[PDB]
A paper describes a structure:
Here, we present two crystallographic fragment screening campaigns using a 96 fragment sub-selection of the European Fragment Screening Library (EFSL) provided by EU-OPENSCREEN. The performance of this subset was validated in two fragment screening campaigns using the model system endothiapepsin (EP) and the NS2B–NS3 protease complex of the Zika virus. EP is an aspartic protease with the catalytic dyad formed by Asp35 and Asp219 and has served as a model protein for finding inhibitors for other aspartic proteases like β-secretase, a key target for treating Alzheimer's disease. As a second and real-life target, we addressed the NS2B–NS3 Zika protease which is crucial for the viral life cycle of the Zika virus but with its shallow active site challenging to target.
The protein construct contains the soluble part of the membrane bound NS2B co-factor and the protease domain of the NS3 protease/helicase protein of the Zika virus. The NS2B–NS3 Zika protease is a heterodimer, the NS2B co-factor wraps around the NS3 protease domain and forms part of S2 and S3 pocket. For the second fragment screening campaign LigandFit and PanDDA were used to identify binding events. With this campaign 18 fragments were identified as crystallographic binders with a total of 22 binding events. Out of the 22 binding events 10 fragments are binding in the S1 subpocket of the active site close to the catalytic triad forming π–π stacking interaction with Tyr161. For expansion of the fragment hits seven representative hits close by or at the active site were selected. Fragments EOS102546, EOS102659, EOS102811, EOS102592, EOS102818 and EOS102869 form π–π stacking interaction with Tyr161. Whereas the second binder, based on fragment hit EOS102818, EOS90861 keeps the initial binding mode exactly with an RMSD of 0.37 Å between the MCS of fragment hit and follow-up binder. Compound EOS90861 forms a new H-bond with Asp129D and interacts as well via π–π stacking with Tyr130B. The compounds EOS41783 and EOS90861, as well as the fragments on which they are based, were assessed by TSA, but no temperature shift was observed.
Numbering used by the authors:
A (entry chain B): 18 to 28, 31 to 156, 160 to 170
B (entry chain A): 50 to 88
């Protein structure tokens, strides 16, 4: 239940299917990573609480807690947790997805699929969204943030 | 079955590798959560 970034694993052997963020007792990941399945954490079980396919997000144990947003000007850091490698920070200036409903920050970083759900951070260390729902032009990920 | 393993703190790192572009792209988001390019 400790705050932090976590690998999401499945089991013959084990494979990393994604990543997520524990904050304020709630686990946050992308819907496409877990498809809303319950998760084991040690001897305990985490059940889904809120989710939305269109936003590609899901929270476990409580409502979505992450609310910071990219300021539109500053570099950010992808806290990537790739399969089989230690967590690492990659700094970048986001581009932009321009949509009919407004602009969304986007990172032009292409990491292994099992990295989906990794958090993107502002300079204060706040999570401004999760990595792994995007488009191909190279892959570009939206900075996907939910609503608190 | 699906399980979680802690991998680190959520912290900014002053010595991070820096990379990547900042493209500006017109996109649409459909009901299935899929982004596509628009022209």
């Amino acid at each position: 239940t400790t705050d932090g970034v976590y690998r999401v694993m499945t089991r013959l052997g084990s494979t990393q299917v994604g990543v997520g963020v524990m904050q304020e007792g709630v686990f946050h990941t992308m819907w496409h990573v877990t498809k809303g399945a319950a998760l084991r954490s040690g001897e305990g079980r985490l059940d889904p609480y809120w989710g939305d396919v269109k936003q590609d997000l899901v929270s476990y144990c409580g409502p979505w807690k992450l609310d910071a947003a990219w300021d539109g000007l500053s570099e950010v850091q992808l806290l990537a947790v790739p399969p089989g490698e230690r967590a690492k920070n990659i700094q970048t200036l986001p581009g932009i997805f321009k949509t009919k409903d407004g602009d969304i920050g986007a990172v032009a970083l292409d990491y292994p699929a099992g990295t989906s759900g990794s958090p993107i951070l502002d300079k204060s260390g706040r999570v401004i969204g999760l990595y792994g729902n995007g488009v191909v032009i190279s892959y570009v990920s939206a900075i996907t943030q939910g609503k608190r | 079955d699906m399980y979680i393993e802690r991998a680190g703190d959520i912290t900014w790192e002053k010595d991070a590798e820096v990379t990547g572009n900042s493209p500006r792209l017109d996109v649409a988001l459909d009901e299935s959560g899929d982004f596509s390019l628009v022209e």
